[PDB]
């Protein structure tokens, strides 16, 4: 598909169509403050091309939005390279949300989840987040319809044990939460339970093939999931390999090269030698 940059969508739905061809959002996705929107505005709205967000997903005050199952049906990975106060997923004051419905969400690399103050929000207790986040310790899921004993959650689905009891796991009435065998780890699997290639992230279109991932556990280059960017390529945005020229083009109106990475700024003890974008250490104290 396409790589789009981090987006900030407010007030009107008009700007939302900027995501239409998008596959990876390199940066964050914030959709917020839509006070005049109604359910009808979302009945026909879908971005099935979105597979991954490199930073974080934030939904706040978006009126008329009842589920995300149609909006982001194929979002599989949120990498959490940059987070919104320790969170890679924020669902806050989503007056009208009845369920999450992100049935393709397999992994949150990095972050934690904050789902707070959602009157109407159910299908939360049906989610085993331990399959999605390494650390659920820091999850802050409070003040939702779910807290007040009367969610009519209904799921065939695989059950998992979180407290002392086994509970069936699903996203909506019609979508189970996919659970891959223990041995697949984070790589994902096919319907038949066959593990995806070890360089894949949440799922694959074919098993045992690093060119057929729908994610990349490590880095992406020329179709394939690779463990590392080989030289002459540089690690970029913690998910893709680029050449020096790309990093240079960006810099020229402030990306720099350091430790085989194309980075926003030089780290501590270093300053930027102008002709080659390379971070070089400071002779005496650092000018800044």
């Amino acid at each position: 598909g396409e790589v789009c940059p981090g987006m900030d969508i407010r007030n009107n739905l008009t700007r939302l169509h900027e995501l239409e061809n998008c596959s990876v959002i390199e940066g964050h996705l914030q959709i917020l403050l839509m006070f005049k929107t109604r359910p009808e505005d979302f009945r026909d709205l879908s971005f099935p091309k979105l597979i991954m967000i490199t930073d974080y997903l934030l939904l706040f005050r978006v009126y008329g939005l009842e589920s995300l199952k149609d909006l982001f049906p194929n979002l599989t990975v949120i990498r959490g390279s940059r987070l919104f106060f320790n969170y890679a997923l924020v669902i806050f004051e989503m007056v009208h949300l009845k369920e999450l419905g992100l049935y393709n969400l397999m992994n949150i690399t990095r972050g934690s989840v904050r789902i707070e103050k959602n009157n109407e929000l159910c299908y939360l207790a049906t989610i085993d987040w331990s399959r999605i986040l390494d650390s659920v310790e820091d999850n802050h899921i409070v003040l939702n319809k779910d807290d007040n004993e009367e969610c009519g959650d209904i799921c065939n689905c695989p059950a998992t044990v979180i407290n002392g009891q086994f509970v069936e796991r699903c996203w909506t009435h019609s979508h189970c939460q996919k659970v891959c065998p223990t041995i697949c780890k984070s790589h994902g699997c096919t319907a038949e339970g066959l593990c995806c290639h070890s360089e894949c992230l949440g799922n694959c279109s074919q098993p045992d093939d690093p060119t057929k991932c729908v994610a990349c556990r490590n880095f992406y280059l020329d179709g394939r999931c690779v463990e590392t960017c080989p030289p002459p390529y540089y690690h970029f945005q913690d998910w893709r390999c680029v050449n020096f020229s790309f990093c240079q083009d960006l810099h020229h109106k402030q990306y720099v090269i350091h430790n085989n990475k194309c980075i926003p700024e030089c780290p501590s003890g270093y300053t930027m030698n102008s002709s080659n974008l390379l971070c070089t250490p400071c002779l005496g104290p650092c000018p800044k």
Partner: antibody, heavy 118, light 113 residues
Framework: QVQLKESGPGLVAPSQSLSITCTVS????????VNWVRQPPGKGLEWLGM???????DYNSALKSRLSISKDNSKSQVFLKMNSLQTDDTARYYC????????????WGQGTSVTVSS | DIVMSQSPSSLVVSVGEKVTMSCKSS????????????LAWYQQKPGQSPKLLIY???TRESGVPDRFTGSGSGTDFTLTISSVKAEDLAVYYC????????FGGGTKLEIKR
């Protein structure tokens, strides 16, 4: 199903060119690199060059423009061309896959023997 | 250009014994960004094509017996064969894949019988 096979001319007259086609299958040339390695009888392995997924080229410094590596992604073919061969270019020529970012040369062709004489 | 050099040119051992051969690169092959060494070891049985055994100087390829143990870092490397088996007879090569790719002169393994 990863396979590589070299189609060589077998015999090259001194001062003439060498053209070898490496026909690959089971993977896309768009996502993987292909190298060429030669082995003179009873001698070691010599790395000749590679072609990356993006068509970028790498050649052994010794090959002062005598070596050309090109490819046709749609036909899963990699082309080696070497100008003005001499007797010391008598060797077995192999094309080998390269999963560059992730692995070193995995999957070697059986090789094609090249003899330079008139 | 990166130059690779191996020793011995050849070695002989009987079945059951452990074997060690060495490699040297003119430049460091240890990648900063992940702390991995960009070196590989191949085994070539006579009459056959060479086979990948070890990459990242220590990572064993799938289908490779635990007998083969890759070692070393920076510019100097070694390949070890824990308990030589009859069919371990072959020429062993080191390859750098840090910048371009270059093979060492290789080392020949003979079996004492």
């Amino acid at each position: 199903q990863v396979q590589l096979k070299e189609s060589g001319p077998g015999l090259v007259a001194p001062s003439q060119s060498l053209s070898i086609t490496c026909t690959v299958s089971g993977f896309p040339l768009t996502a993987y690199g292909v190298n060429w390695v030669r082995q003179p009888p009873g001698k070691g392995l010599e790395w000749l060059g590679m072609i990356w997924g993006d068509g970028n080229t790498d050649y052994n410094s010794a090959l002062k423009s005598r070596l050309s590596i090109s490819k046709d992604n749609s036909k899963s073919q990699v082309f080696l061309k070497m100008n003005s061969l001499q007797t010391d270019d008598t060797a077995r020529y192999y094309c080998a896959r390269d999963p560059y970012g992730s692995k070193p040369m995995d999957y070697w062709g059986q090789g094609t023997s090249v003899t330079v004489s008139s | 250009d990166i130059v690779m050099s191996q020793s011995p040119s050849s070695l002989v051992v009987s079945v059951g014994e452990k074997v060690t051969m060495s490699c040297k690169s003119s430049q460091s092959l240890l990648y900063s960004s992940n702390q991995k060494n960009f070196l590989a070891w191949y085994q070539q049985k006579p009459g056959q094509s060479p086979k990948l055994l070890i990459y990242w100087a220590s990572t064993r390829e799938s289908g490779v017996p635990d007998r083969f143990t890759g070692s070393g870092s920076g510019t100097d490397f070694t390949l070890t064969i824990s308990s030589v088996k009859a069919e371990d007879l072959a020429v062993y090569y080191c390859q750098q894949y840090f910048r371009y790719r270059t093979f060492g002169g290789g080392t020949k393994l003979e079996i004492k019988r």
